[model samples]
Target: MAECVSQAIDINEPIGNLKKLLEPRLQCSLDAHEICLQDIQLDPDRSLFDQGVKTDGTVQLSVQVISYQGMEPKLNILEIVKTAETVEW
Candidate 1:
Protein backbone atom coordinates (compact mmCIF):
# COMPACT_ATOMS: atom_id res chain seq x y z
CA MET A 1 0.00 0.00 0.00
CA ALA A 2 2.83 2.39 0.81
CA GLU A 3 4.50 1.68 -2.51
CA CYS A 4 1.28 2.19 -4.41
CA VAL A 5 0.51 5.39 -2.52
CA SER A 6 4.02 6.69 -3.14
CA GLN A 7 3.78 5.86 -6.83
CA ALA A 8 0.44 7.60 -7.11
CA ILE A 9 1.69 10.79 -5.49
CA ASP A 10 5.05 10.74 -7.34
CA ILE A 11 3.17 10.45 -10.61
CA ASN A 12 0.98 13.44 -9.60
CA GLU A 13 -2.24 11.45 -9.72
CA PRO A 14 -5.25 12.02 -7.46
CA ILE A 15 -5.96 9.62 -4.58
CA GLY A 16 -9.05 8.46 -6.46
CA ASN A 17 -6.85 7.63 -9.42
CA LEU A 18 -4.95 5.30 -7.12
CA LYS A 19 -8.12 3.67 -5.81
CA LYS A 20 -9.51 3.19 -9.31
CA LEU A 21 -6.24 1.74 -10.57
CA LEU A 22 -6.45 -0.96 -7.94
CA GLU A 23 -10.12 -1.82 -8.35
CA PRO A 24 -10.29 -4.20 -11.32
CA ARG A 25 -6.72 -5.01 -12.35
CA LEU A 26 -5.70 -5.85 -8.80
CA GLN A 27 -8.83 -7.66 -7.62
CA CYS A 28 -7.33 -11.16 -7.61
CA SER A 29 -3.78 -10.62 -8.82
CA LEU A 30 -0.51 -11.54 -7.12
CA ASP A 31 0.28 -7.86 -6.58
CA ALA A 32 -2.97 -7.52 -4.71
CA HIS A 33 -2.41 -10.27 -2.19
CA GLU A 34 -1.42 -9.27 1.35
CA ILE A 35 -0.97 -5.59 0.52
CA CYS A 36 -2.65 -3.34 3.02
CA LEU A 37 -1.14 -1.22 5.79
CA GLN A 38 -2.52 1.05 8.47
CA ASP A 39 0.08 3.32 10.09
CA ILE A 40 -1.99 4.02 13.17
CA GLN A 41 -2.07 0.30 13.90
CA LEU A 42 1.72 0.40 14.24
CA ASP A 43 1.75 3.43 16.52
CA PRO A 44 2.48 2.28 20.11
CA ASP A 45 1.83 -1.42 20.68
CA ARG A 46 3.72 -3.34 18.00
CA SER A 47 7.37 -3.63 17.09
CA LEU A 48 8.87 -4.05 13.60
CA PHE A 49 8.74 -7.80 14.22
CA ASP A 50 4.95 -7.66 14.16
CA GLN A 51 5.01 -5.53 11.02
CA GLY A 52 6.41 -7.33 7.92
CA VAL A 53 8.13 -10.57 8.82
CA LYS A 54 6.17 -13.74 8.05
CA THR A 55 7.54 -15.94 10.84
CA ASP A 56 8.74 -16.02 14.42
CA GLY A 57 12.34 -15.87 13.22
CA THR A 58 14.87 -13.09 12.85
CA VAL A 59 15.87 -11.70 9.46
CA GLN A 60 19.31 -10.20 8.83
CA LEU A 61 19.17 -6.65 7.57
CA SER A 62 21.57 -4.21 5.94
CA VAL A 63 21.50 -0.50 5.13
CA GLN A 64 23.28 1.14 2.18
CA VAL A 65 23.60 4.14 -0.17
CA ILE A 66 22.98 6.96 2.22
CA SER A 67 24.84 10.13 3.13
CA TYR A 68 24.39 12.99 5.55
CA GLN A 69 26.47 16.02 6.44
CA GLY A 70 26.01 15.36 10.13
CA MET A 71 26.05 11.89 11.61
CA GLU A 72 23.45 11.01 14.21
CA PRO A 73 22.11 14.52 14.46
CA LYS A 74 19.50 15.40 17.08
CA LEU A 75 16.01 16.09 15.80
CA ASN A 76 14.15 19.25 16.79
CA ILE A 77 10.47 19.35 15.88
CA LEU A 78 9.78 23.02 16.51
CA GLU A 79 12.90 24.09 14.63
CA ILE A 80 11.97 21.76 11.81
CA VAL A 81 8.48 23.20 11.62
CA LYS A 82 9.86 26.75 11.59
CA THR A 83 12.39 25.92 8.88
CA ALA A 84 9.74 24.22 6.79
CA GLU A 85 7.45 27.20 7.14
CA THR A 86 10.11 29.75 6.16
CA VAL A 87 12.08 28.14 3.35
CA GLU A 88 13.52 30.48 0.70
CA TRP A 89 11.52 30.51 -2.51
Candidate 2:
Protein backbone atom coordinates (compact mmCIF):
# COMPACT_ATOMS: atom_id res chain seq x y z
CA MET A 1 0.00 0.00 0.00
CA ALA A 2 3.04 2.29 0.15
CA GLU A 3 3.21 2.75 -3.63
CA CYS A 4 2.09 1.80 -7.14
CA VAL A 5 -0.56 4.42 -7.53
CA SER A 6 -3.83 2.73 -8.51
CA GLN A 7 -1.73 0.47 -10.74
CA ALA A 8 -1.02 3.68 -12.67
CA ILE A 9 2.61 4.55 -13.33
CA ASP A 10 4.93 5.60 -16.10
CA ILE A 11 8.18 3.78 -16.75
CA ASN A 12 10.32 6.85 -17.35
CA GLU A 13 8.85 8.75 -14.42
CA PRO A 14 11.24 9.61 -11.62
CA ILE A 15 10.74 8.18 -8.14
CA GLY A 16 10.41 11.66 -6.70
CA ASN A 17 7.44 12.27 -8.96
CA LEU A 18 5.71 9.30 -7.43
CA LYS A 19 6.68 10.53 -3.96
CA LYS A 20 5.03 13.85 -4.72
CA LEU A 21 1.93 12.15 -6.08
CA LEU A 22 1.80 9.77 -3.14
CA GLU A 23 1.22 12.55 -0.60
CA PRO A 24 -2.30 13.43 -1.76
CA ARG A 25 -3.56 9.84 -1.75
CA LEU A 26 -1.86 8.83 1.49
CA GLN A 27 -2.84 12.10 3.20
CA CYS A 28 0.53 12.45 4.95
CA SER A 29 3.59 14.60 4.59
CA LEU A 30 6.55 12.67 3.23
CA ASP A 31 9.93 14.03 4.26
CA ALA A 32 11.51 11.17 2.39
CA HIS A 33 10.70 7.80 0.79
CA GLU A 34 12.45 4.67 -0.37
CA ILE A 35 11.43 2.76 -3.47
CA CYS A 36 11.67 -0.99 -3.09
CA LEU A 37 11.57 -2.88 -6.37
CA GLN A 38 11.67 -6.49 -5.27
CA ASP A 39 14.15 -5.29 -2.58
CA ILE A 40 16.45 -3.07 -4.62
CA GLN A 41 16.73 0.30 -2.87
CA LEU A 42 16.46 3.25 -5.25
CA ASP A 43 17.04 6.97 -5.11
CA PRO A 44 14.16 9.38 -5.57
CA ASP A 45 15.86 11.24 -8.44
CA ARG A 46 16.06 8.14 -10.62
CA SER A 47 13.46 6.55 -12.83
CA LEU A 48 11.96 3.09 -12.30
CA PHE A 49 13.70 1.39 -15.20
CA ASP A 50 16.99 2.96 -14.19
CA GLN A 51 17.30 0.14 -11.70
CA GLY A 52 15.18 -2.94 -12.53
CA VAL A 53 11.87 -4.14 -14.06
CA LYS A 54 9.25 -6.82 -13.52
CA THR A 55 9.61 -8.16 -17.13
CA ASP A 56 6.30 -9.96 -16.62
CA GLY A 57 4.52 -7.35 -18.78
CA THR A 58 3.38 -5.66 -15.58
CA VAL A 59 5.17 -3.67 -12.90
CA GLN A 60 4.57 -3.13 -9.24
CA LEU A 61 6.33 -1.02 -6.62
CA SER A 62 6.31 -0.91 -2.84
CA VAL A 63 7.41 2.38 -1.30
CA GLN A 64 8.91 2.63 2.15
CA VAL A 65 6.94 5.49 3.64
CA ILE A 66 9.45 7.63 5.52
CA SER A 67 7.78 9.79 8.12
CA TYR A 68 8.20 13.12 9.86
CA GLN A 69 10.82 14.96 11.96
CA GLY A 70 8.87 14.98 15.24
CA MET A 71 7.73 11.33 15.05
CA GLU A 72 9.11 9.41 18.03
CA PRO A 73 9.84 5.72 18.34
CA LYS A 74 6.77 4.38 20.16
CA LEU A 75 7.39 0.69 19.46
CA ASN A 76 8.76 -1.39 22.34
CA ILE A 77 10.28 -4.81 21.65
CA LEU A 78 9.55 -6.07 25.19
CA GLU A 79 5.90 -5.10 24.92
CA ILE A 80 5.52 -7.01 21.66
CA VAL A 81 7.29 -10.10 23.04
CA LYS A 82 5.16 -10.14 26.19
CA THR A 83 1.97 -9.69 24.19
CA ALA A 84 2.91 -12.58 21.91
CA GLU A 85 3.67 -14.83 24.91
CA THR A 86 0.31 -14.00 26.41
CA VAL A 87 -1.59 -15.27 23.35
CA GLU A 88 -4.41 -17.70 24.32
CA TRP A 89 -3.50 -20.22 21.64
Candidate 3:
Protein backbone atom coordinates (compact mmCIF):
# COMPACT_ATOMS: atom_id res chain seq x y z
CA MET A 1 0.00 0.00 0.00
CA ALA A 2 3.07 2.21 0.24
CA GLU A 3 5.43 1.21 -2.50
CA CYS A 4 5.97 0.84 -6.21
CA VAL A 5 7.74 -1.51 -8.66
CA SER A 6 11.13 -1.10 -10.26
CA GLN A 7 11.95 0.64 -13.54
CA ALA A 8 15.36 0.23 -15.14
CA ILE A 9 17.21 2.86 -17.05
CA ASP A 10 20.55 3.16 -18.70
CA ILE A 11 23.34 4.75 -16.75
CA ASN A 12 24.64 8.24 -17.54
CA GLU A 13 21.11 9.48 -17.97
CA PRO A 14 19.73 12.76 -16.68
CA ILE A 15 17.11 12.86 -13.99
CA GLY A 16 14.80 14.75 -16.34
CA ASN A 17 14.72 11.78 -18.68
CA LEU A 18 13.74 9.54 -15.83
CA LYS A 19 10.99 11.94 -14.75
CA LYS A 20 9.54 11.97 -18.24
CA LEU A 21 9.74 8.21 -18.41
CA LEU A 22 8.04 7.75 -15.07
CA GLU A 23 5.37 10.45 -15.30
CA PRO A 24 3.10 8.35 -17.48
CA ARG A 25 3.66 5.06 -15.69
CA LEU A 26 3.73 6.39 -12.17
CA GLN A 27 0.84 8.77 -12.73
CA CYS A 28 2.81 11.65 -11.33
CA SER A 29 1.75 15.20 -11.90
CA LEU A 30 3.40 16.91 -14.85
CA ASP A 31 5.89 18.70 -12.59
CA ALA A 32 5.42 16.79 -9.39
CA HIS A 33 7.94 13.98 -9.37
CA GLU A 34 10.67 14.78 -6.90
CA ILE A 35 13.81 12.64 -6.92
CA CYS A 36 15.97 12.10 -3.91
CA LEU A 37 19.41 10.54 -3.57
CA GLN A 38 20.92 9.54 -0.25
CA ASP A 39 18.14 11.63 1.26
CA ILE A 40 19.26 14.62 -0.78
CA GLN A 41 16.63 15.88 -3.22
CA LEU A 42 17.89 16.05 -6.78
CA ASP A 43 16.93 18.24 -9.67
CA PRO A 44 16.16 17.27 -13.25
CA ASP A 45 19.46 18.36 -14.80
CA ARG A 46 21.56 16.28 -12.42
CA SER A 47 23.35 13.27 -13.87
CA LEU A 48 22.07 9.96 -12.55
CA PHE A 49 25.21 7.88 -12.48
CA ASP A 50 27.68 10.67 -11.97
CA GLN A 51 26.35 11.61 -8.54
CA GLY A 52 27.01 8.24 -6.85
CA VAL A 53 23.65 6.82 -7.92
CA LYS A 54 24.02 3.23 -9.10
CA THR A 55 21.55 0.48 -9.82
CA ASP A 56 23.67 -2.22 -8.23
CA GLY A 57 21.22 -4.77 -6.89
CA THR A 58 19.41 -2.19 -4.88
CA VAL A 59 15.73 -1.27 -4.41
CA GLN A 60 15.71 2.12 -5.95
CA LEU A 61 13.22 4.70 -7.14
CA SER A 62 13.86 7.51 -4.71
CA VAL A 63 10.82 9.20 -6.10
CA GLN A 64 7.89 11.06 -4.60
CA VAL A 65 4.80 12.02 -6.58
CA ILE A 66 1.77 14.23 -6.29
CA SER A 67 -0.66 11.39 -5.74
CA TYR A 68 -0.24 7.64 -6.26
CA GLN A 69 -3.08 5.14 -6.20
CA GLY A 70 -1.01 2.09 -5.46
CA MET A 71 -3.06 1.50 -2.33
CA GLU A 72 -6.70 1.33 -1.42
CA PRO A 73 -8.55 4.49 -2.31
CA LYS A 74 -10.06 6.00 0.77
CA LEU A 75 -11.10 9.24 -0.90
CA ASN A 76 -12.90 9.58 -4.20
CA ILE A 77 -11.14 11.08 -7.21
CA LEU A 78 -13.23 14.15 -6.53
CA GLU A 79 -14.04 14.15 -2.86
CA ILE A 80 -16.40 16.22 -0.74
CA VAL A 81 -15.17 16.54 2.80
CA LYS A 82 -18.02 18.62 3.98
CA THR A 83 -21.66 17.64 3.88
CA ALA A 84 -23.13 20.38 6.04
CA GLU A 85 -22.51 23.56 4.18
CA THR A 86 -24.85 25.90 6.03
CA VAL A 87 -27.66 25.66 8.61
CA GLU A 88 -30.24 28.40 9.05
CA TRP A 89 -30.65 27.34 12.64
Candidate 4:
Protein backbone atom coordinates (compact mmCIF):
# COMPACT_ATOMS: atom_id res chain seq x y z
CA MET A 1 0.00 0.00 0.00
CA ALA A 2 1.07 3.59 -0.54
CA GLU A 3 2.10 5.81 2.35
CA CYS A 4 -0.87 7.21 4.25
CA VAL A 5 -0.13 10.67 5.60
CA SER A 6 -1.89 13.67 7.10
CA GLN A 7 -1.21 17.39 7.37
CA ALA A 8 -2.75 20.28 9.24
CA ILE A 9 -5.47 22.26 7.49
CA ASP A 10 -7.84 24.87 8.74
CA ILE A 11 -11.45 23.90 9.21
CA ASN A 12 -12.59 27.02 7.39
CA GLU A 13 -10.14 26.67 4.51
CA PRO A 14 -11.40 25.46 1.15
CA ILE A 15 -10.48 21.97 0.04
CA GLY A 16 -8.81 23.43 -3.03
CA ASN A 17 -6.29 25.15 -0.79
CA LEU A 18 -5.48 21.81 0.82
CA LYS A 19 -4.06 20.49 -2.42
CA LYS A 20 -1.89 23.59 -2.83
CA LEU A 21 -0.49 23.12 0.66
CA LEU A 22 -0.25 19.31 0.70
CA GLU A 23 1.73 18.96 -2.52
CA PRO A 24 4.61 21.07 -1.21
CA ARG A 25 4.61 19.23 2.11
CA LEU A 26 4.65 15.92 0.27
CA GLN A 27 7.61 17.07 -1.83
CA CYS A 28 9.41 18.02 1.35
CA SER A 29 8.98 14.47 2.63
CA LEU A 30 10.60 13.10 -0.52
CA ASP A 31 14.19 14.25 -0.62
CA ALA A 32 14.57 13.59 -4.39
CA HIS A 33 11.04 13.52 -5.71
CA GLU A 34 8.38 15.93 -6.91
CA ILE A 35 4.62 15.78 -6.90
CA CYS A 36 1.89 17.45 -8.92
CA LEU A 37 -1.37 18.76 -7.56
CA GLN A 38 -3.19 16.59 -10.08
CA ASP A 39 -1.37 13.50 -8.86
CA ILE A 40 -2.67 13.91 -5.32
CA GLN A 41 -5.92 12.14 -4.43
CA LEU A 42 -8.18 13.28 -1.62
CA ASP A 43 -11.72 14.38 -0.88
CA PRO A 44 -11.45 17.80 -2.44
CA ASP A 45 -15.07 18.72 -1.76
CA ARG A 46 -15.05 17.57 1.88
CA SER A 47 -13.86 19.22 5.07
CA LEU A 48 -12.29 17.76 8.22
CA PHE A 49 -15.63 17.05 9.76
CA ASP A 50 -16.97 15.88 6.42
CA GLN A 51 -14.13 13.36 6.21
CA GLY A 52 -13.87 12.66 9.95
CA VAL A 53 -10.31 13.83 10.62
CA LYS A 54 -8.53 15.13 13.71
CA THR A 55 -4.99 15.77 14.94
CA ASP A 56 -4.60 16.19 18.69
CA GLY A 57 -7.59 18.59 18.74
CA THR A 58 -6.41 20.23 15.51
CA VAL A 59 -7.85 19.58 12.07
CA GLN A 60 -5.78 17.20 9.97
CA LEU A 61 -6.35 16.35 6.31
CA SER A 62 -5.47 13.09 4.62
CA VAL A 63 -3.45 13.09 1.41
CA GLN A 64 -2.76 9.99 -0.71
CA VAL A 65 -0.10 9.43 -3.35
CA ILE A 66 -1.71 7.80 -6.39
CA SER A 67 1.35 7.36 -8.59
CA TYR A 68 4.78 8.66 -9.56
CA GLN A 69 3.94 9.67 -13.13
CA GLY A 70 5.00 13.23 -12.34
CA MET A 71 8.64 12.08 -12.17
CA GLU A 72 10.78 12.85 -15.23
CA PRO A 73 11.81 10.04 -17.55
CA LYS A 74 15.44 8.96 -17.49
CA LEU A 75 17.73 10.16 -20.30
CA ASN A 76 18.51 7.55 -22.98
CA ILE A 77 22.27 7.53 -23.22
CA LEU A 78 22.36 5.01 -26.11
CA GLU A 79 20.05 7.15 -28.18
CA ILE A 80 22.09 10.22 -27.31
CA VAL A 81 25.35 8.56 -28.37
CA LYS A 82 23.80 7.37 -31.65
CA THR A 83 22.55 10.83 -32.41
CA ALA A 84 25.91 12.31 -31.49
CA GLU A 85 27.80 9.90 -33.78
CA THR A 86 25.65 11.03 -36.70
CA VAL A 87 26.61 14.64 -36.12
CA GLU A 88 29.35 16.16 -38.33
CA TRP A 89 31.13 17.60 -35.28
- Regions more than 4 Å wrong, model 4: 28-46, 49-58, 67-89
lDDT of 2 by residue, 1-89 (tens): 22233322444556445456656755756554454443445555755456443222223333444323543211101110111232111
Q: Which stretch of 10 consecutive residues in model 1 shows the poorest summed lDDT?
A: 73-82
Q: In terms of lDDT, which candidate is strongest? A: 3
- The clash number for model 3 is 0
TM-score of 1: 0.20
Please say which candidate is ahead in lDDT: 2 or 4: 2
Candidate 1: count of backbone clashes, pairs at least 3 residues apart or interchain: 0
Q: What's each prediction's TM-score? A: 0.20, 0.48, 0.47, 0.37
Candidate 1 off by > 4 Å: 1-46, 63-67, 71-89
Prediction 2 TM-score vs. true: 0.48
Residue 34, model 1: Cα distance from true site in angstroms: 28
Q: Kindly give the stretch of ten consecutive residues in candidate 3 with the minimal lDDT sum.
A: 73-82
Q: How much is the lDDT of residue 89 in candidate 4?
A: 12
TM-score of 4: 0.37
lDDT of 3 at 2: 29
